[PDB]
Amino acid sequence: ARAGLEDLQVAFRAFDQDGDGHITVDELRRAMAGLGQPLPQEELDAMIREADVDQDGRVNYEEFARMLAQE
């Protein structure tokens, strides 16, 4: 389909809980090494701000994708 979305769900699958579970934002940064841009500090940082579901760096694993594609 597309990066951003498919890429990011495939990213998630490194450190996913189980679907509408939680990610570890840092693990997320690690996961991106599987994609192409390992330690994409900016691309992650950009998403880090969106990854604020709690008030820290917890994101609903699925809901994340919805924020990735902030359109």
Coordinates of all heavy atoms in Angstrom, one line a residue:
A1 N 0.8 -1.2 0.0 CA 0.0 0.0 0.0 C 0.9 1.3 0.0 O 1.0 1.9 -1.0 CB -1.0 0.0 1.2
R2 N 1.4 1.6 1.1 CA 2.2 2.9 1.3 C 3.0 2.9 2.6 O 2.5 2.4 3.6 CB 1.2 4.1 1.3 CG 1.4 5.0 0.1 CD 0.9 6.4 0.5 NE 0.1 7.1 -0.5 CZ 0.3 7.2 -1.8 NH1 1.5 6.8 -2.3 NH2 -0.6 7.8 -2.6
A3 N 4.1 3.5 2.5 CA 4.9 3.9 3.7 C 4.1 5.1 4.3 O 3.0 5.5 3.9 CB 6.3 4.4 3.2
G4 N 4.7 5.6 5.4 CA 3.8 6.0 6.5 C 3.1 4.8 6.9 O 3.6 3.9 7.6
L5 N 1.9 4.5 6.4 CA 1.0 3.7 7.1 C 1.4 2.2 7.2 O 1.6 1.7 8.3 CB -0.4 3.8 6.5 CG -1.5 3.0 7.1 CD1 -1.7 3.2 8.6 CD2 -2.9 3.3 6.4
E6 N 1.6 1.5 6.1 CA 2.0 0.1 6.1 C 3.4 0.0 6.8 O 3.6 -0.8 7.7 CB 2.0 -0.4 4.7 CG 1.9 -2.0 4.7 CD 2.0 -2.5 3.3 OE1 1.8 -1.7 2.3 OE2 2.3 -3.7 3.1
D7 N 4.3 0.9 6.5 CA 5.7 0.9 7.0 C 5.6 1.0 8.5 O 6.2 0.2 9.2 CB 6.4 2.1 6.5 CG 7.1 1.9 5.2 OD1 6.5 1.2 4.3 OD2 8.2 2.5 5.0
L8 N 4.8 1.9 9.0 CA 4.6 2.2 10.4 C 3.9 1.0 11.1 O 4.4 0.6 12.2 CB 3.9 3.5 10.5 CG 4.7 4.7 10.2 CD1 5.2 5.5 11.4 CD2 6.0 4.5 9.4
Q9 N 2.9 0.4 10.6 CA 2.3 -0.8 11.2 C 3.4 -2.0 11.2 O 3.5 -2.7 12.2 CB 1.0 -1.2 10.5 CG 0.1 -2.0 11.5 CD -1.4 -1.6 11.3 OE1 -2.1 -2.2 10.5 NE2 -1.9 -0.6 12.0
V10 N 4.1 -2.1 10.2 CA 5.2 -3.1 10.1 C 6.3 -2.7 11.1 O 6.9 -3.6 11.8 CB 5.7 -3.1 8.6 CG1 7.0 -3.8 8.5 CG2 4.6 -3.9 7.8
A11 N 6.6 -1.4 11.3 CA 7.5 -0.9 12.3 C 7.0 -1.4 13.7 O 7.7 -2.1 14.4 CB 7.5 0.7 12.3
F12 N 5.7 -1.0 14.0 CA 5.1 -1.4 15.2 C 5.3 -2.8 15.6 O 5.6 -3.2 16.7 CB 3.6 -1.0 15.2 CG 3.4 0.5 15.4 CD1 2.7 1.3 14.5 CD2 3.9 1.1 16.5 CE1 2.9 2.7 14.5 CE2 4.0 2.5 16.7 CZ 3.6 3.3 15.6
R13 N 5.1 -3.7 14.6 CA 5.2 -5.2 14.8 C 6.5 -5.6 15.4 O 6.6 -6.8 15.8 CB 4.9 -5.9 13.4 CG 4.7 -7.4 13.5 CD 3.7 -7.8 14.6 NE 3.3 -9.2 14.5 CZ 2.3 -9.7 15.2 NH1 1.7 -9.0 16.2 NH2 1.9 -11.0 15.0
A14 N 7.6 -4.8 15.5 CA 8.7 -5.1 16.3 C 8.4 -5.1 17.8 O 8.8 -6.1 18.5 CB 9.9 -4.1 15.9
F15 N 7.9 -4.0 18.3 CA 7.6 -3.8 19.7 C 6.1 -3.5 19.9 O 5.7 -2.5 20.6 CB 8.4 -2.7 20.2 CG 9.9 -2.9 19.8 CD1 10.4 -2.2 18.7 CD2 10.6 -3.9 20.5 CE1 11.7 -2.5 18.3 CE2 11.9 -4.2 20.0 CZ 12.5 -3.5 18.9
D16 N 5.2 -4.3 19.3 CA 3.8 -4.1 19.5 C 3.3 -4.9 20.7 O 4.0 -5.9 21.1 CB 3.1 -4.7 18.2 CG 3.4 -6.1 17.8 OD1 4.5 -6.5 18.0 OD2 2.4 -6.8 17.3
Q17 N 2.2 -4.4 21.3 CA 1.5 -5.2 22.3 C 0.7 -6.3 21.6 O 1.1 -7.4 21.5 CB 0.7 -4.4 23.3 CG 1.4 -4.2 24.6 CD 0.3 -4.0 25.7 OE1 -0.3 -2.9 25.8 NE2 0.0 -5.0 26.5
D18 N -0.5 -5.9 21.1 CA -1.4 -6.9 20.5 C -2.5 -6.2 19.7 O -3.5 -6.9 19.4 CB -2.0 -7.7 21.6 CG -2.6 -9.0 21.1 OD1 -2.1 -9.6 20.1 OD2 -3.6 -9.4 21.7
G19 N -2.5 -4.9 19.3 CA -3.7 -4.3 18.7 C -4.5 -3.6 19.8 O -4.8 -4.2 20.8
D20 N -4.6 -2.3 19.6 CA -5.2 -1.4 20.6 C -4.5 -1.6 21.9 O -5.1 -1.3 23.0 CB -6.7 -1.4 20.5 CG -7.2 0.0 20.9 OD1 -6.9 0.9 20.2 OD2 -7.9 0.1 22.0
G21 N -3.3 -2.0 21.9 CA -2.4 -2.2 23.1 C -1.6 -0.9 23.2 O -2.0 0.1 22.7
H22 N -0.4 -1.0 23.8 CA 0.5 0.2 23.9 C 1.8 -0.1 23.2 O 2.3 -1.2 23.3 CB 0.7 0.5 25.3 CG -0.3 1.6 25.8 ND1 -1.3 1.4 26.8 CD2 -0.3 2.9 25.5 CE1 -1.9 2.6 27.0 NE2 -1.3 3.5 26.2
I23 N 2.4 0.9 22.6 CA 3.8 0.9 22.2 C 4.7 1.7 23.2 O 4.2 2.5 24.0 CB 4.0 1.6 20.8 CG1 3.5 3.0 20.7 CG2 3.5 0.6 19.8 CD1 4.7 4.0 20.8
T24 N 6.0 1.4 23.1 CA 7.1 2.0 23.7 C 7.8 2.9 22.6 O 8.3 2.4 21.6 CB 8.0 0.9 24.2 OG1 7.2 0.3 25.3 CG2 9.3 1.3 24.8
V25 N 7.6 4.2 22.7 CA 8.0 5.2 21.7 C 9.5 5.0 21.3 O 9.9 5.3 20.2 CB 7.7 6.6 22.2 CG1 8.7 7.1 23.1 CG2 7.4 7.6 21.1
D26 N 10.3 4.6 22.3 CA 11.7 4.4 22.0 C 12.0 3.2 21.1 O 12.5 3.3 20.0 CB 12.6 4.5 23.3 CG 13.8 5.3 23.0 OD1 13.7 6.5 23.2 OD2 14.8 4.7 22.6
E27 N 11.5 2.0 21.5 CA 11.3 0.8 20.7 C 10.8 1.1 19.3 O 11.4 0.7 18.4 CB 10.3 -0.1 21.5 CG 11.0 -1.2 22.3 CD 11.6 -0.7 23.6 OE1 12.0 0.5 23.7 OE2 11.5 -1.5 24.6
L28 N 9.8 2.0 19.2 CA 9.4 2.5 17.9 C 10.5 3.0 17.1 O 10.7 2.7 15.9 CB 8.4 3.7 18.2 CG 7.0 3.5 17.6 CD1 6.4 4.9 17.7 CD2 7.0 3.2 16.1
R29 N 11.4 3.9 17.7 CA 12.6 4.4 17.0 C 13.5 3.3 16.6 O 14.1 3.4 15.5 CB 13.3 5.4 18.0 CG 14.1 6.4 17.3 CD 14.7 7.4 18.3 NE 13.7 8.0 19.2 CZ 13.8 7.9 20.5 NH1 14.9 7.6 21.2 NH2 12.7 7.9 21.3
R30 N 13.6 2.3 17.4 CA 14.4 1.1 17.1 C 13.8 0.4 15.9 O 14.5 0.0 15.0 CB 14.5 0.2 18.4 CG 15.9 -0.3 18.6 CD 16.5 -1.1 17.5 NE 17.9 -1.6 17.9 CZ 18.8 -2.1 17.1 NH1 18.5 -2.2 15.8 NH2 20.0 -2.5 17.5
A31 N 12.5 0.2 15.9 CA 11.7 -0.5 14.9 C 12.0 0.1 13.5 O 12.2 -0.7 12.5 CB 10.2 -0.4 15.1
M32 N 12.0 1.4 13.4 CA 12.3 2.1 12.2 C 13.7 1.7 11.5 O 13.8 1.8 10.3 CB 12.2 3.6 12.4 CG 10.8 4.0 13.0 SD 9.6 4.6 11.8 CE 10.1 6.4 11.8
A33 N 14.6 1.1 12.3 CA 15.8 0.5 11.7 C 15.5 -0.7 10.8 O 16.2 -0.9 9.8 CB 16.7 0.0 12.8
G34 N 14.4 -1.4 11.0 CA 13.9 -2.5 10.1 C 13.4 -1.9 8.8 O 13.4 -2.6 7.8
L35 N 13.0 -0.6 8.8 CA 12.4 0.0 7.6 C 13.5 0.5 6.6 O 13.6 0.0 5.5 CB 11.5 1.2 8.0 CG 10.2 0.7 8.6 CD1 9.4 1.9 9.1 CD2 9.3 0.0 7.5
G36 N 14.3 1.4 7.0 CA 15.2 2.1 6.1 C 16.0 3.3 6.7 O 17.1 3.4 6.4
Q37 N 15.3 4.0 7.6 CA 15.9 5.2 8.3 C 16.2 4.7 9.8 O 15.3 5.0 10.6 CB 15.0 6.4 8.1 CG 13.5 6.1 8.4 CD 12.7 7.4 8.5 OE1 13.1 8.5 8.4 NE2 11.4 7.2 8.9
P38 N 17.3 4.1 10.1 CA 17.5 3.6 11.5 C 17.8 4.9 12.4 O 18.6 5.7 12.0 CB 18.8 2.7 11.4 CG 19.5 3.3 10.2 CD 18.4 3.7 9.2
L39 N 17.2 4.9 13.5 CA 17.3 6.1 14.4 C 17.0 7.4 13.6 O 17.8 8.3 13.5 CB 18.6 6.2 15.1 CG 18.5 7.3 16.2 CD1 18.0 6.7 17.5 CD2 19.8 8.0 16.5
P40 N 15.7 7.5 13.1 CA 15.3 8.6 12.4 C 14.9 9.7 13.4 O 13.7 9.9 13.7 CB 14.1 8.2 11.6 CG 13.5 7.0 12.4 CD 14.6 6.5 13.3
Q41 N 15.9 10.3 14.1 CA 15.6 11.1 15.2 C 14.6 12.1 15.0 O 13.7 12.2 15.8 CB 16.9 11.6 15.9 CG 17.3 11.0 17.2 CD 16.4 11.5 18.4 OE1 16.9 11.6 19.5 NE2 15.1 11.7 18.2
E42 N 14.6 12.8 13.8 CA 13.6 13.8 13.5 C 12.2 13.2 13.2 O 11.2 13.7 13.7 CB 14.1 14.6 12.3 CG 15.3 15.4 12.6 CD 15.8 16.3 11.5 OE1 15.0 17.2 11.1 OE2 16.9 16.0 10.9
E43 N 12.2 12.2 12.4 CA 10.9 11.6 12.0 C 10.2 11.0 13.2 O 9.1 11.2 13.5 CB 11.2 10.6 10.9 CG 10.5 10.9 9.6 CD 9.2 10.1 9.4 OE1 9.3 8.8 9.4 OE2 8.1 10.7 9.4
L44 N 11.0 10.4 14.1 CA 10.5 9.9 15.4 C 10.1 11.1 16.2 O 9.0 11.1 16.6 CB 11.5 8.9 16.0 CG 10.8 7.7 16.7 CD1 9.9 8.1 17.9 CD2 10.0 6.8 15.7
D45 N 11.0 12.1 16.6 CA 10.7 13.3 17.3 C 9.4 13.9 16.9 O 8.6 14.3 17.7 CB 11.9 14.3 17.3 CG 13.0 14.0 18.2 OD1 13.0 13.1 19.0 OD2 14.0 14.8 18.1
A46 N 9.2 14.1 15.6 CA 8.0 14.6 15.0 C 6.8 13.8 15.5 O 5.9 14.3 16.1 CB 8.2 14.6 13.5
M47 N 6.9 12.5 15.3 CA 5.9 11.6 15.9 C 5.9 11.5 17.4 O 4.8 11.2 18.0 CB 6.1 10.1 15.3 CG 5.4 10.0 14.0 SD 6.1 10.7 12.5 CE 4.9 10.5 11.3
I48 N 7.0 11.7 18.1 CA 7.1 11.7 19.6 C 6.0 12.6 20.1 O 5.3 12.3 21.1 CB 8.5 12.0 20.1 CG1 9.4 10.8 20.0 CG2 8.4 12.5 21.6 CD1 10.8 11.0 20.6
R49 N 5.9 13.8 19.5 CA 4.9 14.8 19.9 C 3.5 14.3 19.7 O 2.6 14.6 20.6 CB 5.2 16.2 19.2 CG 4.4 17.3 20.0 CD 4.9 18.7 19.6 NE 4.4 19.6 20.7 CZ 5.0 20.8 20.9 NH1 6.0 21.3 20.1 NH2 4.7 21.5 22.0
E50 N 3.2 13.6 18.6 CA 1.9 13.0 18.4 C 1.7 11.8 19.3 O 0.5 11.5 19.7 CB 1.9 12.6 16.9 CG 2.1 13.8 16.0 CD 2.1 13.3 14.5 OE1 2.6 12.3 14.2 OE2 1.5 14.1 13.7
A51 N 2.7 11.2 19.7 CA 2.7 10.0 20.6 C 2.5 10.4 22.1 O 3.2 9.9 22.9 CB 4.0 9.2 20.4
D52 N 1.5 11.3 22.4 CA 1.3 11.8 23.7 C 0.0 11.4 24.3 O -0.5 12.1 25.1 CB 1.5 13.4 23.7 CG 0.4 14.1 22.9 OD1 -0.3 13.4 22.1 OD2 0.2 15.3 23.2
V53 N -0.5 10.3 23.9 CA -1.9 9.8 24.3 C -2.0 9.8 25.8 O -3.0 10.4 26.3 CB -2.1 8.4 23.7 CG1 -3.3 7.7 24.4 CG2 -2.3 8.4 22.2
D54 N -1.1 9.3 26.6 CA -1.2 9.5 28.0 C -0.8 10.9 28.4 O -1.7 11.8 28.6 CB -0.2 8.5 28.8 CG -0.7 7.1 29.0 OD1 -1.8 6.8 28.5 OD2 0.0 6.4 29.7
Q55 N 0.5 11.2 28.4 CA 1.1 12.5 28.9 C 2.6 12.3 29.0 O 3.2 12.7 30.0 CB 0.5 12.9 30.2 CG 0.4 11.8 31.2 CD 0.4 12.2 32.7 OE1 0.2 13.4 33.0 NE2 0.6 11.3 33.6
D56 N 3.2 11.5 28.1 CA 4.6 11.0 28.3 C 5.1 10.4 27.0 O 5.7 11.2 26.2 CB 4.5 10.0 29.4 CG 5.7 9.0 29.5 OD1 6.8 9.4 30.0 OD2 5.5 7.9 29.0
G57 N 4.9 9.1 26.7 CA 5.3 8.5 25.5 C 4.6 7.1 25.4 O 5.2 6.2 24.8
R58 N 3.4 7.0 25.9 CA 2.5 5.9 25.7 C 1.6 6.3 24.5 O 1.1 7.4 24.5 CB 1.6 5.7 26.9 CG 2.3 4.8 28.0 CD 3.3 5.5 28.8 NE 3.8 4.7 29.9 CZ 4.4 5.1 31.0 NH1 4.9 6.4 31.1 NH2 4.5 4.3 32.1
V59 N 1.4 5.4 23.5 CA 0.5 5.5 22.4 C -0.3 4.2 22.3 O 0.4 3.2 22.3 CB 1.2 5.8 21.1 CG1 0.3 6.5 20.1 CG2 2.4 6.7 21.4
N60 N -1.6 4.3 22.0 CA -2.4 3.2 21.6 C -1.8 2.7 20.3 O -1.7 3.4 19.3 CB -3.9 3.5 21.5 CG -4.7 2.8 22.6 OD1 -4.3 2.8 23.8 ND2 -5.7 2.1 22.2
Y61 N -1.3 1.4 20.3 CA -0.6 0.8 19.2 C -1.3 1.1 17.8 O -0.6 1.4 16.9 CB -0.3 -0.7 19.5 CG -0.3 -1.6 18.3 CD1 0.9 -2.0 17.7 CD2 -1.5 -1.9 17.7 CE1 0.9 -2.8 16.5 CE2 -1.5 -2.5 16.4 CZ -0.3 -3.0 15.8 OH -0.3 -3.6 14.6
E62 N -2.6 0.9 17.8 CA -3.4 1.1 16.5 C -3.6 2.6 16.3 O -3.1 3.1 15.3 CB -4.7 0.4 16.6 CG -5.2 -0.1 15.2 CD -5.3 1.0 14.2 OE1 -6.0 2.0 14.5 OE2 -4.6 0.9 13.1
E63 N -4.2 3.3 17.3 CA -4.5 4.7 17.3 C -3.3 5.5 16.8 O -3.5 6.5 16.0 CB -5.0 5.2 18.6 CG -5.8 6.5 18.6 CD -6.1 6.9 20.0 OE1 -5.2 7.0 20.8 OE2 -7.3 7.2 20.2
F64 N -2.1 5.1 17.1 CA -0.9 5.7 16.6 C -1.0 6.0 15.1 O -0.7 7.1 14.6 CB 0.3 4.8 16.8 CG 1.7 5.5 16.5 CD1 2.6 5.8 17.5 CD2 2.0 5.9 15.2 CE1 3.6 6.7 17.3 CE2 3.1 6.7 14.9 CZ 3.9 7.1 15.9
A65 N -1.3 5.0 14.3 CA -1.3 5.0 12.9 C -2.2 6.2 12.4 O -1.9 6.9 11.5 CB -1.9 3.7 12.4
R66 N -3.3 6.4 13.1 CA -4.3 7.5 12.9 C -3.6 8.8 13.1 O -4.0 9.8 12.4 CB -5.5 7.3 13.9 CG -6.8 7.5 13.3 CD -7.9 7.2 14.3 NE -9.2 7.0 13.7 CZ -10.0 8.0 13.3 NH1 -9.6 9.3 13.4 NH2 -11.2 7.8 12.7
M67 N -2.7 8.9 14.0 CA -1.9 10.2 14.2 C -0.7 10.3 13.3 O -0.5 11.4 12.8 CB -1.4 10.3 15.7 CG -2.5 10.2 16.8 SD -3.7 11.6 16.8 CE -4.6 11.2 18.3
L68 N 0.0 9.2 13.0 CA 1.0 9.2 11.9 C 0.4 10.0 10.7 O 0.9 10.9 10.2 CB 1.3 7.7 11.5 CG 1.5 7.5 10.0 CD1 2.7 8.1 9.5 CD2 1.5 6.0 9.8
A69 N -0.8 9.5 10.3 CA -1.5 10.1 9.1 C -2.5 11.2 9.6 O -3.7 11.0 9.6 CB -2.1 9.1 8.3
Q70 N -1.9 12.2 10.1 CA -2.6 13.4 10.8 C -3.4 14.2 9.7 O -3.3 15.4 9.7 CB -1.6 14.2 11.6 CG -0.4 14.8 10.7 CD 0.0 16.2 11.2 OE1 -0.2 17.2 10.6 NE2 0.6 16.3 12.4
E71 N -4.1 13.6 8.8 CA -4.8 14.2 7.7 C -6.3 14.1 8.0 O -6.7 13.1 8.6 CB -4.5 13.5 6.3 CG -3.0 13.7 5.9 CD -2.7 13.0 4.6 OE1 -3.3 13.5 3.6 OE2 -1.9 12.1 4.6

